[PDB]
Design a protein around this ligand. Sequence first.
Ligand SMILES: [Zn+2]
Length: 194
Amino acid sequence: SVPSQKTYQGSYGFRLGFLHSGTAKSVTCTYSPALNKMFCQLAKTCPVQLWVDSTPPPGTRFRAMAIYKQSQHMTEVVRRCPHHERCSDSDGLAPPQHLIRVEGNLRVEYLDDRNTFRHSVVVPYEPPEVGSDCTTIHYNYMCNSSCMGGMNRRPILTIITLEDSSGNLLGRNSFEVRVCACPGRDRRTEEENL
Ligand SMILES: [Zn+2]
């Protein structure tokens, strides 16, 4: 039981885009093109852009789900550590076990899969303003990569699926995530190896 991570642009040319924030110490979120990897801080805004070549149907939704990047951990459900699950950081919408939240959207929906037990967060797709190129969603990651009892220093991927009103697959993309105290420093360091 592991969700597919195969990239699939689909009929609407579904792609992800990210801000070009750089690696100065003050950045709270930064994306590495070379590593296809997002470096972000705990509970801080994480902008992800949805790009499409054609506007998807009314009722289209997009879903985010985390899985472990390493094959020997892939079947394990990614969830918050007991400490953070018990933290008083609720937004009144997200379940306490869920790693990924959506910020600033009251139509957000959260799922515990009854069969796979996977967590995911789903949101109604809205097309960009006519003068805009893409739709920006603000995610929050509610555990650090280094959380004891949670991700436990294990790398994760976030999978974003585009789906129709019936939940049929329309598109898929993914990116690796590290949730850390110093995204800029950590990105610059990880790219040093290239
Ligand atoms: Zn944690």
